[PDB]
PDB file of C-alpha atoms (C1' of nucleotides) and ligand atoms in Angstrom:
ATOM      1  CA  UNK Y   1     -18.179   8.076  44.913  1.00  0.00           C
ATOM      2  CA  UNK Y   2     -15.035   8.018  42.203  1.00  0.00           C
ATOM      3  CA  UNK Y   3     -12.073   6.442  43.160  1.00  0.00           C
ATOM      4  CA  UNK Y   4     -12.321   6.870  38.867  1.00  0.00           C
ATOM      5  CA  UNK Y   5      -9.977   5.371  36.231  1.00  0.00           C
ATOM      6  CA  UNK Y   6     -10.160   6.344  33.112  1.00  0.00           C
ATOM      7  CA  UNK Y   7     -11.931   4.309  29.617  1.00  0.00           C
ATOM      8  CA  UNK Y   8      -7.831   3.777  28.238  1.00  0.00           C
ATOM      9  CA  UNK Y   9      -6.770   2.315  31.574  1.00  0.00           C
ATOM     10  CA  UNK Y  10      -9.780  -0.318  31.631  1.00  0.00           C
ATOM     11  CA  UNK Y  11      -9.575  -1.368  27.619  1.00  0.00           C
ATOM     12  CA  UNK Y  12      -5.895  -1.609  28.498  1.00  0.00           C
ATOM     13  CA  UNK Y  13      -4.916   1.001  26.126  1.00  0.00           C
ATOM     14  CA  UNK Y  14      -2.032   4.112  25.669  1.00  0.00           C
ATOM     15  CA  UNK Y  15      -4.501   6.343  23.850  1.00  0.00           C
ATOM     16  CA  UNK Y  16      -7.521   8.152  24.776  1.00  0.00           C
ATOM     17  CA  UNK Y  17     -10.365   6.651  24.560  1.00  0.00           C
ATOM     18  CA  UNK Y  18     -12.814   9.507  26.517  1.00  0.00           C
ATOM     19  CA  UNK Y  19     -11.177  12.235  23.758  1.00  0.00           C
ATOM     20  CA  UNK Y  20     -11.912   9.693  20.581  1.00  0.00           C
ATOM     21  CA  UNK Y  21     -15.272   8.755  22.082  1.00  0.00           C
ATOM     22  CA  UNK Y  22     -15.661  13.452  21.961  1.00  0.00           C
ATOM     23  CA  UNK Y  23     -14.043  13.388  19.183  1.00  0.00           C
ATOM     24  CA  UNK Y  24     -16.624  11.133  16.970  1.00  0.00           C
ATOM     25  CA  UNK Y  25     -19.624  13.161  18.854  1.00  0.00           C
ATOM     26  CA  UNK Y  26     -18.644  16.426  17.621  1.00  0.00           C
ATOM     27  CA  UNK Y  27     -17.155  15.047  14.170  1.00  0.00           C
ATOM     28  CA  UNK Y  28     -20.514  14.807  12.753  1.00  0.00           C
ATOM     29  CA  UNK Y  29     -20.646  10.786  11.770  1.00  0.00           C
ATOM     30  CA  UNK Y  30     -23.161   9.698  13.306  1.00  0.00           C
ATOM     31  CA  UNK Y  31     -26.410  11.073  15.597  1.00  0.00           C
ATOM     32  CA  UNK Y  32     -25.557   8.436  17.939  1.00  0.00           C
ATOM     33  CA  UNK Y  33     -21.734   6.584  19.078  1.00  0.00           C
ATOM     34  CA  UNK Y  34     -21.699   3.135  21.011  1.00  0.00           C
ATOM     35  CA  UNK Y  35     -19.597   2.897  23.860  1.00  0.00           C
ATOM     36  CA  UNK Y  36     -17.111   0.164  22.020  1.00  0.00           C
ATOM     37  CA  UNK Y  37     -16.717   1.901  19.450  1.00  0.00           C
ATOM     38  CA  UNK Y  38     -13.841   4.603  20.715  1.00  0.00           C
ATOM     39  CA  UNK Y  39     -12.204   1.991  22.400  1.00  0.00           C
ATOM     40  CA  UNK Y  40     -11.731  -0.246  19.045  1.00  0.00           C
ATOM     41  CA  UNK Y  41     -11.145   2.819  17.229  1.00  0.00           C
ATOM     42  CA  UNK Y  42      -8.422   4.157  19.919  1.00  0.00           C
ATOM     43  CA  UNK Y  43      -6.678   0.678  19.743  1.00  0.00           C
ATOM     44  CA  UNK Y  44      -6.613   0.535  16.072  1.00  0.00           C
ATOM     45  CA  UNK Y  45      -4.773   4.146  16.014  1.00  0.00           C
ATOM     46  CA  UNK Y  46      -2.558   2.775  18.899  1.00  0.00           C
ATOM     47  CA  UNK Y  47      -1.859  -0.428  17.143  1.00  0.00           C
ATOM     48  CA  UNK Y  48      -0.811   1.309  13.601  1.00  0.00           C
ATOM     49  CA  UNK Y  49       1.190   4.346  15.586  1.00  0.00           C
ATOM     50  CA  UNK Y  50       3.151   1.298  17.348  1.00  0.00           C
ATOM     51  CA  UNK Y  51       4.006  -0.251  13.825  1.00  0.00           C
ATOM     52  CA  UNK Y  52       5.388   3.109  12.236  1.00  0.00           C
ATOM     53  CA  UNK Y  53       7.178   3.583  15.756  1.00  0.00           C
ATOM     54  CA  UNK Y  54       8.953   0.281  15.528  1.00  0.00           C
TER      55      UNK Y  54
ATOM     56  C1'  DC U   1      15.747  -9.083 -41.846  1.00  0.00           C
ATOM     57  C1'  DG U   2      12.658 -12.385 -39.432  1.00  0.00           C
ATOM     58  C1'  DT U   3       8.276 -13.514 -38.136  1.00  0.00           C
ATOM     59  C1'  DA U   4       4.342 -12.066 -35.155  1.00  0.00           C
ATOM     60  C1'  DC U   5       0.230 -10.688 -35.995  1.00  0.00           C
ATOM     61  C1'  DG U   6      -4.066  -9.628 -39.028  1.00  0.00           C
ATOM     62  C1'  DT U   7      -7.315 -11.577 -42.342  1.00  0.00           C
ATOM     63  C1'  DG U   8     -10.483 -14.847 -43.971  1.00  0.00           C
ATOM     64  C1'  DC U   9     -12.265 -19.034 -44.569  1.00  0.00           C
ATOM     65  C1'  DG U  10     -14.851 -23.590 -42.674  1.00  0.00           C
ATOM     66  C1'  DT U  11     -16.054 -26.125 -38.357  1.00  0.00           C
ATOM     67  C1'  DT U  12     -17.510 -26.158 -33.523  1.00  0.00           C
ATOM     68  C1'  DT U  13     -19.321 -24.349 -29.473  1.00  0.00           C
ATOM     69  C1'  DA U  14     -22.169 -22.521 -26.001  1.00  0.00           C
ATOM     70  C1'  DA U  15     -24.449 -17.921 -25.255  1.00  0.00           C
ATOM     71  C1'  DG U  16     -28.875 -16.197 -25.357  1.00  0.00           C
ATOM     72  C1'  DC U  17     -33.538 -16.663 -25.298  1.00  0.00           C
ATOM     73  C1'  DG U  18     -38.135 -17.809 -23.404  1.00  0.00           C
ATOM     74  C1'  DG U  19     -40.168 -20.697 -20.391  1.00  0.00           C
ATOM     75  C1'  DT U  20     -41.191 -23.296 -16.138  1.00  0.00           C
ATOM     76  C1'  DG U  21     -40.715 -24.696 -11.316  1.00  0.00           C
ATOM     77  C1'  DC U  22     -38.910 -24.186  -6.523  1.00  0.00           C
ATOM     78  C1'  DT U  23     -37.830 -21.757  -2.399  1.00  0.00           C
ATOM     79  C1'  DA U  24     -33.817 -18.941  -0.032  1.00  0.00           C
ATOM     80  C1'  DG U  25     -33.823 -15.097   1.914  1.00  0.00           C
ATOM     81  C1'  DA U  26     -34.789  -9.995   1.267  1.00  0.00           C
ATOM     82  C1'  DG U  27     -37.333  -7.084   3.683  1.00  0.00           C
ATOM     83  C1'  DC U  28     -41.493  -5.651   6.213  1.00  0.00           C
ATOM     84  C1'  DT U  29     -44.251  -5.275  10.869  1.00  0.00           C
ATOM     85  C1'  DG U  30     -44.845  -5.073  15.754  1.00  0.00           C
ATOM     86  C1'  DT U  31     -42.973  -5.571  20.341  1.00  0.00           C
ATOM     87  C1'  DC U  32     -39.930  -4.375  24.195  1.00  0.00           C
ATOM     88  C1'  DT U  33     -35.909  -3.148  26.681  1.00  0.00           C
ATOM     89  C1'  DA U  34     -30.763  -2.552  26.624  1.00  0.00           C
ATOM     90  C1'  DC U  35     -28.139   1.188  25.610  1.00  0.00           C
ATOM     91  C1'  DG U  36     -26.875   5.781  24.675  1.00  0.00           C
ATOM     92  C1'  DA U  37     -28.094  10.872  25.289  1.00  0.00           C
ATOM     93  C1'  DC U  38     -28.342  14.300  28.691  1.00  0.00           C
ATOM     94  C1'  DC U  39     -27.331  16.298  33.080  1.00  0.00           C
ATOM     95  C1'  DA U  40     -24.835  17.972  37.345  1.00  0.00           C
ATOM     96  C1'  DA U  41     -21.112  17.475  40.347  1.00  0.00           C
ATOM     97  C1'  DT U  42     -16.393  16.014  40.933  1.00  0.00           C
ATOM     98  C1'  DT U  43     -11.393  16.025  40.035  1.00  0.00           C
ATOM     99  C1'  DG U  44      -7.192  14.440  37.755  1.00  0.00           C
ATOM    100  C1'  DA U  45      -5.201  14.107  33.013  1.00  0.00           C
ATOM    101  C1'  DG U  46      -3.108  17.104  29.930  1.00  0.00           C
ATOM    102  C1'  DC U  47      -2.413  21.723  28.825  1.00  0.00           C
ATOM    103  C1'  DG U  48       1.116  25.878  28.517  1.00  0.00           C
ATOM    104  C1'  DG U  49       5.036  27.634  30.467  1.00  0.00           C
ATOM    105  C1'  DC U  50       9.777  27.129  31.747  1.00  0.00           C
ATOM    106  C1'  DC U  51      14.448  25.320  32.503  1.00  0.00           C
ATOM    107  C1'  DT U  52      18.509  21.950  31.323  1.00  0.00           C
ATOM    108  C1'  DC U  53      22.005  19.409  29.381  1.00  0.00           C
ATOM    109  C1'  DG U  54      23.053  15.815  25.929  1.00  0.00           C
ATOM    110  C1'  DG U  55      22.117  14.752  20.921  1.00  0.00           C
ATOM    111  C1'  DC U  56      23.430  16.207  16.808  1.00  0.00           C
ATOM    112  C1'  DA U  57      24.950  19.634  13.374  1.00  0.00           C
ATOM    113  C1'  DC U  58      29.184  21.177  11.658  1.00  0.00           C
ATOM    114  C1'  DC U  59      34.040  21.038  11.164  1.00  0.00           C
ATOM    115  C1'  DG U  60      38.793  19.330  10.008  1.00  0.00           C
ATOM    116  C1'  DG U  61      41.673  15.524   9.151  1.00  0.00           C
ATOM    117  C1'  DG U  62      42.721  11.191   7.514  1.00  0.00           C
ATOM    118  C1'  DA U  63      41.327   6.575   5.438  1.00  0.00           C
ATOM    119  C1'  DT U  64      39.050   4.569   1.649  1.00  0.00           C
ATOM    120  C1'  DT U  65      36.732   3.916  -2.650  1.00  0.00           C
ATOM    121  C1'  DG U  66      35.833   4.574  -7.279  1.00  0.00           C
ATOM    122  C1'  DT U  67      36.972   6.737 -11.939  1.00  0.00           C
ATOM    123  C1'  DG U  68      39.534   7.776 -16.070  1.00  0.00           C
ATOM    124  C1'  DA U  69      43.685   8.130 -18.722  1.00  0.00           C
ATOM    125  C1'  DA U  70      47.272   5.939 -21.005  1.00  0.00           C
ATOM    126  C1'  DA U  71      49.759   1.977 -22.543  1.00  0.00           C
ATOM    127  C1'  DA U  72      49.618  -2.784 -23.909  1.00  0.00           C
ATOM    128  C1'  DA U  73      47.533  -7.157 -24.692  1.00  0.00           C
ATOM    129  C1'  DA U  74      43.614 -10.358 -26.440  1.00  0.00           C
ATOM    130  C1'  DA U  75      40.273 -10.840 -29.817  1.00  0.00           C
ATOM    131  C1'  DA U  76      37.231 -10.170 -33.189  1.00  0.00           C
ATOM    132  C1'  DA U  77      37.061  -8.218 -37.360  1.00  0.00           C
ATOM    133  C1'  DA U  78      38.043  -7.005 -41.891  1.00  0.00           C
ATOM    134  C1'  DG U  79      40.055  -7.022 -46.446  1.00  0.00           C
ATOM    135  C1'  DC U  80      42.984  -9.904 -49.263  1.00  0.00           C
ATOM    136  C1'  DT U  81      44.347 -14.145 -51.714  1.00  0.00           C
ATOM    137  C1'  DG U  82      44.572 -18.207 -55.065  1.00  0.00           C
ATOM    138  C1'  DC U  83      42.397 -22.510 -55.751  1.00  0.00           C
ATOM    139  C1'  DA U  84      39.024 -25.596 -56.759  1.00  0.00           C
TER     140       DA U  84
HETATM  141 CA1  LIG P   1      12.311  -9.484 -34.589  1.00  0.00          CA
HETATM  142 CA1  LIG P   2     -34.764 -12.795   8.355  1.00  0.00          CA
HETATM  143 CA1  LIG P   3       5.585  20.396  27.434  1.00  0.00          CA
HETATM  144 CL1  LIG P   4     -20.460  -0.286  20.508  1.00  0.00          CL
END
DNA sequence: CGTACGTGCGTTTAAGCGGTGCTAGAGCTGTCTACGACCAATTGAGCGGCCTCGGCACCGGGATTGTGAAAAAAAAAAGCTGCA
């Protein structure tokens, strides 16, 4: 059992992809929240913090 | 003061209409399982709290840049002439 890396480490990603993925289930979007869809939405607000950072 | 627009004609154009004919594809039904909710147990990422030391705010001094006044030139401008 575990040996567990987090959802961010496996996409390759900075930001957090297990808070977005709570995030959109307690937002009230939709009923139901596919398992890509935090990931794409974490690297899209990872991608567009990197360009204002530069 | 100069001419770009508005009006009003005659000539030309293609929108609109009503109709027909064809089928892409919108959208409905039924089936079945891949995927996401839910759960309980586990634990490590991220929270607040706390301490530090180097960036940056602020200062004074000096270098630098830009502005405005006055004087003097360059130039357009204006009023003034006789001719033609
Ligand atoms: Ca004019
Ligand atoms: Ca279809
Ligand atoms: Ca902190
Ligand atoms: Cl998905």
């Amino acid at each position: 059992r575990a040996k567990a890396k987090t959802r961010s480490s496996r996409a390759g990603l900075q930001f957090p992809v297990g808070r977005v993925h709570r995030l959109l289930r307690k937002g009230n979007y939709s009923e139901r929240v596919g398992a890509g869809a935090p990931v794409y939405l974490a690297a899209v607000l990872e991608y567009l913090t990197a360009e204002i950072l530069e």
